[PDB]
Ligand binder design. Structure first.
Ligand SMILES: Nc1ncnc2c1ncn2[C@@H]1O[C@H](COP(=O)(O)OP(=O)(O)OP(=O)(O)O)[C@@H](O)[C@H]1O
Lengths: 505, 89, 56, 473, 50
């Protein structure tokens, strides 16, 4: 209505700034080609200072020289014209942080693209913040319940444990962190903030239609009330795609330094490396391996180091990071991923053939591992999955061994049958997260060989059948697993009886 | 600031004949009144279904019954077939 | 309180081992589990069935 | 009114440098004219080198040029004519008609470097573009406003396939087609244009249903890195003015990638990986995100992809595959079996082959079809080796079913009516779902395999069954 | 509520083409002449602040 004209006219009153508009920055643009611009003047400019051109496009002054300063653009060069007037902000590049960012969808600069008006920001924060030192940290001791079966079973995640999701094109990578965010609805509907866990998804270099459908889907399952989307789509400039994950990392630091717990998801760092080498080659800087500048390790390094678990002295904040790396044909020896593997605290490899067999999630257990996840696994899951990874590696040993058609003893054929049941067990449809109380009895049935008499095709209906069985009947045991997160011997035997009851069908 | 003031007064006033005083809209040749408050006042119910979805159909549940209250000619056949199944048991 | 009924049901399953070929008694347990699972998801799915006059 | 006269200072191949007078500098990406004796020569401001002097790239041949000539600036970017006048005209990248049917008397002209639509303007759920072809609408369904990677070399009726697509969109949705030959062989472009006249999608007097833009191979890379944007802007007009679903057909995206890499090479930029341009992701994203589904309508883009030296870790197909929502493979082996179209059922895949997208029924039908044909293809070894002896009644049923589908995938073409005489059928989606479902249930196992070759639908199944029964009697 | 937000956005885009109408109203004025004195007194106010 006219209330937008009211708000815009109050902003016209601010437009008061003209009465104190004596900028000590303005200088002419010498040249501006190939995503860069040399500007004369600006003799009190700062290093990595945000400036704004006369055509409204902002920029970061990245390299300072006696004579000129090279400023990168934050958009197309079609708007910037030679010889114009370049006002400096007066600031190193900062972004809005605050709670009102939840639900909104912004650019790399916090300017919202959802069309939902301005941003209720609680402050501005620099992009290239130092990562915290070794002393205000703590080893992770709190779980991140992703809701997926084999993820929460085999590779548990601590609050702040930097875990890589690596895979290939169209291999179910995005759906993993997506359903993790959807699992976080359990406690974001709750009330304890230390149980709560806030979600920031960083879509860079991707299709705007894809991001729109993702935001749509997060509104359908109502994850949006705790979600923050950072869009750096492929139409936009390479420095925006370079810059945006640092900004979202600053947002995660805003949540972490408030004592709260937060989750950031990078998707993908691969295109960020493409944008960064696009920058560096347009900086005329020499490349190294696979035409990348040698600091690209330092790039994703200095990005991902700003994510850990704060100690109690800092208020016990945490920030967990989920990077995504698209590789080329299952290669794990390209220069870009081998850098990331040297940074993150573990790997979640998605084999293309397993999803080609429709096994979704397509987890290669033999490659995927976490380093310190076992310290923060759910204690019941830590009780019930000790033999599980051993048995699955055992079944993997006889997986390639059984292809020759040779008959075997009852031990290895037993492991073959039970590992087939466990393999067909851990499939899980999209948008179907599972609580820990739900994940425990499937593991307890899978360990104790009860699935062996069941048909291999019958396992999928058996899962939902036994779950609805327990939710109908042994709902008290579900509450016990919820409250304790730890199975006593009495809970163990009651669980055994409750299983073997429905195992009789 | 006569820049500011005259720009903002034209900014308020030239739509003020569109919103404050209902004088339609001098520059627009199509009218503004028979679009949103008249034609598309039924807009979301031209975007949804009228008279079943938006009237919402407070509908009585179709009453299903028990097995027609006949427990003779079927229970004794159940007992005879249960003799048969126990001869199979 | 239905857990005692289903405990009695599995007691009747391990005693229905004595009568193999129950045509519809196990199907009766199937139907009661079916609509019990239906009603529990129906009541958990149910909101306070109203339009929020204050906010919404 | 204000002639911004520039002076030529440096001509290096396709690279032109112009010194202007003071405070007259055009922005980047603007058309510049030079009145040659042979017509006009077009330039495109790409690099402000300072000193009132900019660097453009050519749009045609740069022979015989004297440095210091008058350079005329157009101010804006390349205006290209849009509208009903553009249908059935052969247009260069400049915007000029080259079919020699006189000037295009279009009312509007649009700049080619428009921005992509905003994130707020994105339609938040991709429905299925109903094409009309059974196999496409069955196996790899197209997003309304999506990206389609067509594979396969020539000689497989790929042009016949895409003309059948043109007619099926014209009959079904009424939206139009814009074809764009980037680096198209000029002889083959001529044969294409002559065929499109002959198959009736171009009517020289009546309503041609399609607009053509042919950036030929003999044009400098500055042309061929903009022919795609020309066809893009033309399609964007018919979307955003007429509110339609308009189909942009592009060949080749890989020659476009070559053009962009050569443009970045001639501008003295350091080359990146594989010899491609360093701006490769951005040069792609400026093409892709201007192709979307608005609330006004959509532009659905089908574009051929040459796989370079049969490699998929090559960054140009690895970049293109980061945008293609659906693939379509014109194999030789399907055309080898006399099947029109030549679609491989197994490889042509979509990211929208999902039960929450096409409904559960269409998903389950396509699931059973892919499973049946996969088992059939696995059996095709021992079918030729051992015969139907090893087939159980589980197996020879499915073998017969997959034969019936494999004949039943074949569809008559409205463009192969001067070729085969059999008229094509705009086969609807809901007919196709139920037809393949009734084949998947086995309700026509009595019907012979031959009664399925080049048929429209299940009504045509029953009709051809009765006709072949009468001809056998 | 969906149509309410839709109507707000349609109101906003019709006021955007009304902003075009306001600019065309502002273009033909001797505010072009008078506003020079605006800048005059203004720059007096800014430079007399220091
Ligand atoms: N558990 C699942 N249930 C249903 N579908 C799944 C599941 N896991 C993966 N998929 C399918 O995998 C496809 C790819 O999803 P996703 O985008 O996560 O893969 P990706 O490798 O991240 O692709 P990209 O990197 O291009 O985003 C989707 O079409 C989705 O339907």
């Amino acid at each position: 209505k006219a209330q937008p004209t009211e708000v815009s006219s109050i902003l016209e009153e601010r437009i008061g700034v003209s009465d104190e508009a004596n900028l000590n920055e303005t200088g002419r643009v010498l040249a501006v080609g190939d995503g860069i611009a040399r500007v004369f003047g600006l003799n009190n400019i700062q290093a990595e200072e945000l400036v704004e051109f006369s055509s409204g496009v902002k920029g970061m002054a990245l390299n300072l020289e006696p004579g000129q300063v090279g400023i990168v653009l934050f958009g197309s060069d079609r708007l910037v014209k030679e010889g114009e007037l370049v006002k400096r902000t007066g600031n190193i590049v900062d972004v809005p942080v605050g709670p009102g960012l939840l639900g909104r969808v912004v650019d790399a600069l916090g300017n919202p693209i959802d069309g939902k008006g301005p941003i209720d920001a609680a402050g501005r924060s620099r992009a290239q913040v130092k990562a915290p030192g070794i002393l205000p940290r703590r080893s992770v001791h709190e779980p991140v319940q992703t809701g997926l079966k084999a993820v929460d079973a085999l590779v548990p995640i601590g609050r702040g444990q930097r875990e890589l999701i690596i895979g290939d094109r169209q291999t179910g990578k995005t759906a993993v962190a997506l359903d993790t965010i959807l699992n976080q609805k359990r406690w974001n509907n709750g009330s304890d903030e230390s149980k709560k866990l806030y979600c920031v998804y960083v879509a860079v270099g991707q299709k705007r239609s894809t991001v729109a459908q993702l935001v749509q889907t997060l509104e359908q399952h109502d994850a949006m009330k705790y979600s923050i989307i950072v869009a750096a789509t492929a139409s936009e400039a390479a420095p925006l795609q370079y810059l945006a994950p640092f900004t979202a990392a600053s947002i995660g630091e805003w949540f972490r330094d408030n004592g709260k717990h937060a989750l950031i998801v990078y998707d993908d760092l691969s295109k960020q490396a493409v944008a960064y080498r696009q920058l560096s080659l347009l900086l005329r800087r020499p490349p190294g391996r696979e035409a990348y500048p040698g600091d690209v390790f330092y790039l994703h390094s200095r990005l991902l180091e700003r994510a850990a678990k704060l100690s109690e002295k800092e208020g016990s904040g945490s920030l967990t990071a989920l990077p995504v790396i698209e590789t080329q044909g299952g290669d794990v020896s390209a220069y870009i991923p081998t850098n990331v593997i040297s940074i993150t605290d573990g790997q979640i490899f998605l084999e293309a053939e397993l999803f080609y067999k429709g096994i979704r999630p397509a987890i290669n257990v033999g490659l995927s591992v976490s380093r310190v996840g076992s310290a923060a696994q759910v204690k019941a899951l830590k009780q019930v999955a000790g033999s599980l990874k051993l048995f699955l590696a055992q079944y993997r040993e006889v997986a390639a061994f059984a292809q020759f058609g040779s008959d075997l003893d009852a031990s290895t054929k037993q492991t073959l049958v039970r590992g087939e049941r466990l393999t067909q067990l851990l499939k899980q449809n999209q948008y179907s997260p599972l609580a820990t109380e739900e994940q425990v009895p499937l593991i307890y049935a899978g360990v104790n060989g009860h699935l062996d008499g069941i048909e291999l095709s019958r396992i999928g209906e058996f899962e939902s059948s036994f779950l609805s069985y327990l939710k109908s009947n042994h709902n008290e045991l579900l509450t016990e697993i919820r409250e304790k997160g730890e199975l006593s011997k009495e809970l163990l035997a009651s669980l055994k009886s409750a299983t073997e009851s429905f195992v009789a069908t | 600031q006569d820049l500011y003031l005259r720009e903002l007064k034209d900014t308020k006033l030239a739509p003020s004949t569109l919103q404050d005083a209902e004088g339609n809209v001098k520059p627009w040749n199509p009218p503004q009144k028979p679009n949103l408050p008249e034609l598309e006042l039924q807009g979301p119910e031209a975007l949804k279904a009228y008279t079943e979805q938006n009237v919402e159909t407070a509908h009585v549940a179709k009453e299903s019954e028990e097995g027609e209250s006949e427990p003779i000619e079927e229970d004794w056949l159940v007992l005879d077939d249960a003799e048969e199944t126990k001869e199979s048991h | 309180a239905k857990s005692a009924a289903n405990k009695l049901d599995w007691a009747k399953v391990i005693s229905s081992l004595r009568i193999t070929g129950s045509t519809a008694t196990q199907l009766s347990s199937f139907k009661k589990r079916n609509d019990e699972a239906r009603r529990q998801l129906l009541e958990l799915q149910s909101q306070p069935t109203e339009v929020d006059f204050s906010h919404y | 009114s204000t002639p911004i006269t520039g002076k030529v200072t440096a001509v290096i191949g396709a690279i032109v440098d112009v010194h202007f007078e003071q405070s007259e500098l055009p922005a980047i990406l603007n058309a510049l004219e030079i009145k040659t004796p042979q017509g006009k020569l077009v330039l495109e401001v790409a690099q402000h080198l300072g000193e009132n002097t900019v660097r453009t790239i050519a749009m045609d041949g740069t022979e015989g040029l004297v440095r210091g000539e008058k350079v005329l600036d157009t101010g804006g970017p390349i205006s290209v004519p849009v509208g009903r006048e553009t249908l059935g005209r052969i247009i260069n990248v400049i915007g000029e008609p080259i079919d020699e049917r006189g000037p295009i008397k279009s009312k509007l002209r649009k700049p080619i470097h428009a921005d992509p639509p905003s994130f707020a303007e994105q339609s938040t759920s991709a429905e299925i573009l109903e094409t009309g072809i059974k196999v496409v609408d069955l196996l790899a369904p197209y997003a309304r406003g999506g990206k389609i990677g067509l594979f396969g070399g020539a000689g497989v009726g790929k042009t016949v396939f895409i003309q059948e697509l043109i007619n099926n969109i014209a009959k079904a949705h009424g939206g139009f087609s814009v074809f764009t030959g980037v680096g198209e062989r000029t002889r083959e472009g001529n044969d294409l244009y002559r065929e499109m006249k002959e198959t009736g999608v171009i009517n020289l007097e009546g309503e041609s249903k399609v607009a053509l833009v042919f950036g030929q191979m003999n044009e400098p890379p500055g042309a061929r890195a903009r022919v795609a944007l020309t066809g893009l802007t033309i399609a964007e007009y018919f979307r955003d003015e007429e509110g339609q679903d308009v189909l942009l057909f592009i060949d080749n995206i890989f020659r476009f990638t070559q053009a962009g890499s050569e443009v970045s090479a001639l501008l003295g930029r350091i080359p990146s990986a594989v010899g491609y341009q360093p701006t490769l992701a951005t040069d792609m994203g400026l093409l892709q995100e201007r192709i979307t589904t608005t609330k006004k309508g959509s532009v659905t883009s089908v574009q051929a992809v040459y796989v370079p030296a049969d490699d998929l870790t090559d960054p140009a197909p690895a970049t293109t595959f980061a945008h293609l929502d659906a693939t379509t493979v014109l194999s030789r082996g399907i055309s080898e079996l006399g099947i029109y179209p030549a679609v491989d059922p197994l490889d042509s895949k979509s990211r929208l082959l999902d039960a929450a997208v096409v409904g559960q029924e269409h998903y389950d039908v396509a699931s059973k079809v892919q499973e049946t044909l996969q088992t059939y293809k696995s059996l095709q070894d021992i079918i030729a080796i051992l015969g139907m002896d090893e087939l159980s009644e589980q197996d020879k049923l499915t073998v017969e079913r997959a034969r019936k589908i494999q004949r039943f995938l074949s569809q008559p073409f409205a463009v192969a009516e001067v070729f085969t005489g059999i008229p094509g059928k705009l086969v609807r989606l809901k007919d196709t779902v139920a037809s393949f479902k009734a084949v998947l249930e086995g309700k026509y196992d009595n019907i012979p395999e031959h009664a399925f070759y080049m048929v429209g639908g299940i009504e045509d199944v029953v009709a051809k069954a009765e006709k072949l029964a009468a001809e056998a009697n | 509520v969906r149509y309410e937000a839709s109507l707000r956005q349609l109101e906003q885009r019709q006021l955007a083409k009304s902003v075009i109408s306001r600019v065309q109203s502002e273009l033909g004025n001797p505010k072009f002449q008078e506003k020079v004195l605006q800048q005059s007194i203004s720059e007096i106010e800014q430079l007399l602040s220091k």
